Design a protein around this nucleic acid. Structure first.
Ligand SMILES: [Mg+2]
Ligand SMILES: [Mg+2]
Ligand SMILES: [Mg+2]
Ligand SMILES: [Mg+2]
Ligand SMILES: [Mg+2]
Ligand SMILES: [Mg+2]
Ligand SMILES: [Mg+2]
Ligand SMILES: [Mg+2]
Ligand SMILES: [Mg+2]
Ligand SMILES: [Mg+2]
Ligand SMILES: [Mg+2]
Ligand SMILES: [Mg+2]
Ligand SMILES: [Mg+2]
Ligand SMILES: [Mg+2]
Ligand SMILES: [Mg+2]
Ligand SMILES: [Mg+2]
Ligand SMILES: [Mg+2]
Ligand SMILES: [Mg+2]
Ligand SMILES: [Mg+2]
Ligand SMILES: [Mg+2]
Ligand SMILES: [Mg+2]
Ligand SMILES: [Mg+2]
Ligand SMILES: [Mg+2]
Ligand SMILES: [Mg+2]
Ligand SMILES: [Mg+2]
Ligand SMILES: [Mg+2]
Ligand SMILES: [Mg+2]
Ligand SMILES: [Mg+2]
Ligand SMILES: [Mg+2]
Ligand SMILES: [Mg+2]
Ligand SMILES: [Mg+2]
Ligand SMILES: [Mg+2]
Ligand SMILES: [Mg+2]
Ligand SMILES: [Mg+2]
Ligand SMILES: [Mg+2]
Ligand SMILES: [Mg+2]
Ligand SMILES: [Mg+2]
Ligand SMILES: [Mg+2]
Ligand SMILES: [Mg+2]
Ligand SMILES: [Mg+2]
Ligand SMILES: [Mg+2]
Ligand SMILES: [Mg+2]
Ligand SMILES: [Mg+2]
Ligand SMILES: [Mg+2]
Ligand SMILES: [Mg+2]
Ligand SMILES: [Mg+2]
Ligand SMILES: [Mg+2]
Ligand SMILES: [Mg+2]
Ligand SMILES: [Mg+2]
Ligand SMILES: [Mg+2]
Ligand SMILES: [Mg+2]
Ligand SMILES: [Mg+2]
Ligand SMILES: [Mg+2]
Ligand SMILES: [Mg+2]
Ligand SMILES: [Mg+2]
Ligand SMILES: [Mg+2]
Lengths: 127, 92, 76, 99, 106
RNA sequence: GUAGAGAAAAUGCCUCGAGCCAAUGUUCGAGUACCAGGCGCUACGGCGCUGAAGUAACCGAUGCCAUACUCCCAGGAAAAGCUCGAACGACCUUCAACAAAAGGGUACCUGUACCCGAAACCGACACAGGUAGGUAGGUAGAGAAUACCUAGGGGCGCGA
RNA sequence: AGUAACGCAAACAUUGGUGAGAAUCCAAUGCCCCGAAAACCUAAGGGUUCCUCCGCAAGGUUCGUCCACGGAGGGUGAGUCAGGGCCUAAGAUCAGGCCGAAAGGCGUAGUCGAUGGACAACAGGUGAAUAUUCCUGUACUACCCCUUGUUGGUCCCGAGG
RNA sequence: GAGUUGAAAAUAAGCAGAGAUCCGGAGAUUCCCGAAUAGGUCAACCUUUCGAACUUCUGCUGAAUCCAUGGGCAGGCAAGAGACAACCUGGCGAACUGAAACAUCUUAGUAGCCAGAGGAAAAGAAAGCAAAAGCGAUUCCCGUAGUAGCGGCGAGCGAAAUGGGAGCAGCCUAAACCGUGAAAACGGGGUUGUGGGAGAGCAAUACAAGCGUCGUGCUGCUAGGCGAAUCAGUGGAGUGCGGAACCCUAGAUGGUGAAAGUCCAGUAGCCGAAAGCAUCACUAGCUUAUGCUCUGACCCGAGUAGCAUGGGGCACGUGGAAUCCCGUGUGAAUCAGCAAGGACCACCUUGCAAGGCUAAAUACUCCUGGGUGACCGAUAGCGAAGUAGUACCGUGAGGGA
């Protein structure tokens, strides 16, 4: 790792965090990149660099070495991360990706919606 | 009536030592090994073991490591047995 | 110290001027004196140090007025 | 969940119940320090569970003295005198285990 | 400068009995990390120019742009609220291009 | 023991007292402990049994008796512990305090490794150097010189 | 210039073993050196170099399987040894006090301050690295308890030492 | 407002829409050294009767010595101590240098040392400038002006008034007298310069000015939220290219595999504070507070001014040398008076010393937030873009990659 690319830290020894527009499990669509025009659910989030990992997208062959002497290694295919600005939320019942908005409901809970279509994303009790 | 210094009595004993020599010392001398605070004393350690496990202490010997960490040899009376007390803790 | 406790008098910077206008530093000290001064109230002397210019003040205004202006009690 | 109820119970107890309860923890931490050395089955979260539960008690004990009007200089004297008259005892976990 | 740079002051080695070029301070301009000879400082670049020259320079400039200029009527009442879209449409109807530069003096 | 400002001390007076001084030595400590050697085992490390004799004479210290004695001029620390004892003053008290023998019980902090006539300190070096003090064997010898040896440690960090 | 030198003229030698690899590491035998030291303790100082396992990039004036090097883990046990909890010299500080543009200087008791005084332990054994420190045996110092007696003591103060 | 237990992955266990982690306000704890302050000490340790030492404050007790002083005892989160880049004030106070030497002179009241204090400090409410006309506290800038002058008349040093701007604020005491007290002293009274107070006698004295502690709101700061507009192709990646659209009170920035108004965070604009701070407004109610005659009687800050002598500093080097400030020694006057107006006298004008406080304009950056660079881009830029004042050197100060 390169010494200067470490995540910048606040005076309280904690890292400086970014604001995102995604969550774990949300279905999205890649805007640009090598995996352009594909859909998948987000598995993990990396707030310190605004990168996200989607299942079965942006994978690379890793040559795992044989830590044990009794056997040899293998060539595993591991998933990598993508910058969140290169993806967009996606809806299945319309097949149209759009940006994100925010609207208050009658109950008083703030939620986000798709601007073009108009559905709600963060339905309650999903984790 | 006063002690020498004032601090947490429950911090006087951090943890025991687990070495082939320490375990060898339990059976030969009826002793026990314990890492202790730098500000500790033989009196507080003698009073300490008397209260935790309810056993008598024949003698206490101590030393300070080069790293600034104090060690404590604790020889119990022959009436009790350090090996029996060792199994109560979990270490042999 | 060479300070007069009563009047605050002290020495000053002064140069010794030669015929060639050469100037070396010096200090014009104060004419301080150790003396026993009478105090009419308690009817006793007091040991202290003051300048001759301050003696004329006590001789004129009286001791109780001078020492009060300086801000000192005679009883120590 | 263990934040509104934990503090509420302690704010109702008297000082003596709070005092003696701390002595149980300080000795109970010692058993956890033993299990850490023996590599037995111990929960690392118990170190934080108990260490934080002491601070909540000394926190409330201080606040009750603010009501009485105690200063910082005086409170430290009473804290030391309480440690001068301290006496170690076995924890409950040793009594349930010692047989 | 060599006086403002940190360090220096001491003579590193004596003037003679050493087979090397003389030296006065390590923080000299002829060594790295040393002073700067006649380097820049915070300057007041302001100069003076007569008013009638500056006014004449301004008049003759506008008198040259007559072939590429014109006049319009007031339009303050036609904008009841700010809207860049209508403002651009007005320039298109007046014969302008928003891509190029322009100037409204009022 | 006694007199005087006067307990002790000091000074003066009176009186008892042939014995005293201490390195060494005797005995216990001191056991078949330690020990040569022997009997068996082996992964050769030591282990396990066994284990005799354990005295005298001569030489003789720079060490002990020893601030023992003699001589000399340059005339050779202080305080506390310890011991004796009245008054004045202060604190405390019928044991809760002082004092005597035996027995029993209890027992603070730090240093402790390793090098130290040196490769580890001091000399910029794994430098032909400097570094207070203690222990002081055998033959020849006046001798801690010198030569050859013991214990023990070394053959000097490029070689042919 | 692949030149000078590789740090004394106490001296190495063989066999066998280890290993990818040995004049250089280990052992054995023999030879030779120091032996008022080139021996064993120890003060100051250094500050983990000490012990075991692994490794050989760099460091070693060659080599290297080795090392005061590198990595990992472990290691220093005291009522009696040394110092402090007792005393004081040289000397340094100094309550008040005296002096002095300032800082501060002089200075009394007092207090610090071992290079001194005072104060209680030895033998043997155990052994990866410590022991007058741990174990065995036999002693010592201080305090307390116990048993009688005494029943005013403890500091200050005086004197001896 | 959804994932987290630092940098910093991994491991082992937890917390979390019953709202964690995180972000702000007010609080708690805060080991040892260090002003260090229970005593001692070779800083981060020791001994301890367990104590904020000493000075100050509040009490008690009451040496020589009657009152007192000095001690002694106790109380008291108990005022002060120390630290702090530069600027500022005060005290001590250089030399190289320049004069082509050098002593008068200059460098210079600079540097540095010590002490003190604030966000500014200091100065400051005419015993003043001025000149026959007038100004009306202090400070700063322009300008007067490198002028008038000073000067071994050498080097060199260097004003002020008038004028133009920034910024504007004026107040409290001593004394006469009246009461209270043995005195000291307390209260009232009074505070000014074409002279004013006291004193008496008349009046009518003080509502509208300046203050303003309970607290109540206004506006900002200390966490945040809402927030418009794009698709495909270009063979590592498209923000670029070509082509076709859109928003704009938003084309400020940064990031995104490659340069973005329309991908992300955001910006314009709008909304938002329990608690704390600040700027304003309001509010107690005590509050400082308004004028005409009579008097040349009583007061106008004393060892002071002034003089003699020895010096300093004022642009001004003793010069005709005033004005201002000190050591020694002498030593006035009280409005019918005193000082100043560049020796001094006379006349006139101006002003009222010897008591004190006071905001703004001004100077500085170890720092904080925002913004901008014809500033540097690893020999540069802060010495330092990595465990830099580290490694290393030195007994140490200190030097220093
Ligand atoms: Mg020890
Ligand atoms: Mg001069
Ligand atoms: Mg310089
Ligand atoms: Mg210099
Ligand atoms: Mg530079
Ligand atoms: Mg007698
Ligand atoms: Mg040892
Ligand atoms: Mg040793
Ligand atoms: Mg030696
Ligand atoms: Mg040597
Ligand atoms: Mg050398
Ligand atoms: Mg011999
Ligand atoms: Mg010899
Ligand atoms: Mg020989
Ligand atoms: Mg050799
Ligand atoms: Mg060598
Ligand atoms: Mg050699
Ligand atoms: Mg040649
Ligand atoms: Mg040759
Ligand atoms: Mg050579
Ligand atoms: Mg050669
Ligand atoms: Mg020889
Ligand atoms: Mg070794
Ligand atoms: Mg190598
Ligand atoms: Mg080599
Ligand atoms: Mg090593
Ligand atoms: Mg001893
Ligand atoms: Mg003093
Ligand atoms: Mg003295
Ligand atoms: Mg002493
Ligand atoms: Mg000694
Ligand atoms: Mg001792
Ligand atoms: Mg050893
Ligand atoms: Mg202290
Ligand atoms: Mg001190
Ligand atoms: Mg305070
Ligand atoms: Mg201070
Ligand atoms: Mg000069
Ligand atoms: Mg010259
Ligand atoms: Mg010249
Ligand atoms: Mg300040
Ligand atoms: Mg301000
Ligand atoms: Mg200001
Ligand atoms: Mg001021
Ligand atoms: Mg002032
Ligand atoms: Mg009055
Ligand atoms: Mg947007
Ligand atoms: Mg595109
Ligand atoms: Mg905004
Ligand atoms: Mg006046
Ligand atoms: Mg003059
Ligand atoms: Mg005059
Ligand atoms: Mg005139
Ligand atoms: Mg005037
Ligand atoms: Mg640089
Ligand atoms: Mg480059």
């Amino acid at each position: 790792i390169k010494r200067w690319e470490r995540k910048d830290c606040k005076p309280n020894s904690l890292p400086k965090l970014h604001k995102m527009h995604v969550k774990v499990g949300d279905t999205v669509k890649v805007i640009s990149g090598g995996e352009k025009g594909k859909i998948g659910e987000i598995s993990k989030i990396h707030k310190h660099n605004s990168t996200v990992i989607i299942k079965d997208l942006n994978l690379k062959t890793k040559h795992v070495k044989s830590k044990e002497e009794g056997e040899q290694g293998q060539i595993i295919k591991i998933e990598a991360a993508i910058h969140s600005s290169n993806v967009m939320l996606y809806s299945k019942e319309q097949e149209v990706a759009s940006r994100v908005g925010h609207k208050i409901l009658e109950d008083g809970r703030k939620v986000r919606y798709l601007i073009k279509t108009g559905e709600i994303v963060d339905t309650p009790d999903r984790w | 009536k006063y002690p020498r210094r004032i601090l947490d009595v429950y911090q006087i004993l951090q943890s025991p030592i687990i070495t082939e020599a320490a375990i060898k010392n339990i059976a030969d001398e009826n002793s026990l090994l314990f890492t202790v605070d730098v500000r500790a004393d033989k009196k507080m350690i003698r009073e300490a073991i008397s209260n935790f496990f309810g056993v008598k202490v024949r003698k206490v010997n101590t030393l300070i490591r080069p790293d600034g960490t104090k060690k404590a040899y604790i020889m119990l009376n022959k009436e009790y047995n350090a090996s029996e007390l060792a199994k109560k803790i979990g270490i042999f | 110290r060479r300070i007069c406790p009563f009047t605050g008098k002290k020495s000053n910077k002064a140069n010794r001027v030669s015929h060639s206008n050469h100037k070396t530093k010096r200090l014009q000290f104060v004419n301080l004196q150790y003396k026993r001064v009478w105090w009419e109230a308690g009817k006793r002397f007091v040991k202290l140090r003051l300048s001759t210019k301050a003696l004329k003040t006590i001789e004129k205004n009286g001791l109780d007025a001078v020492a009060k202006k300086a801000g000192i009690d005679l009883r120590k | 969940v263990k934040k509104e109820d934990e503090l509420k119970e302690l704010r109702t107890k008297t000082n003596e119940q709070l005092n003696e309860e701390i002595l149980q923890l300080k000795g109970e931490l010692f058993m956890l320090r033993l299990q850490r050395s023996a590599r037995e089955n111990f929960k690392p979260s118990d170190f934080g569970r108990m260490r934080k539960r002491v601070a909540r008690m000394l926190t409330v004990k201080r606040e009750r003295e603010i009501e009485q009007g105690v200063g910082k200089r005086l409170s430290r004297k009473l804290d030391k005198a309480w440690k001068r008259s301290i006496v170690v005892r076995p924890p409950p976990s040793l009594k349930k285990l010692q047989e | 400068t060599r006086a403002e740079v940190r360090g220096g002051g001491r003579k590193p080695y004596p003037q003679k009995k050493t087979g090397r070029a003389r030296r006065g301070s390590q923080r000299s301009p002829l060594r790295p990390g040393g002073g700067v000879i006649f380097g820049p400082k915070p300057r007041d670049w302001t100069i003076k120019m007569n008013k009638k020259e500056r006014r004449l320079a301004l008049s003759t400039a506008i008198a040259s742009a007559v072939g590429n200029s014109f006049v319009v009527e007031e339009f303050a009442e036609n904008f009841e609220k700010p809207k860049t879209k209508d403002f651009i449409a007005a320039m298109q109807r007046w014969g302008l291009d928003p891509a190029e530069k322009s100037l409204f003096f009022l």
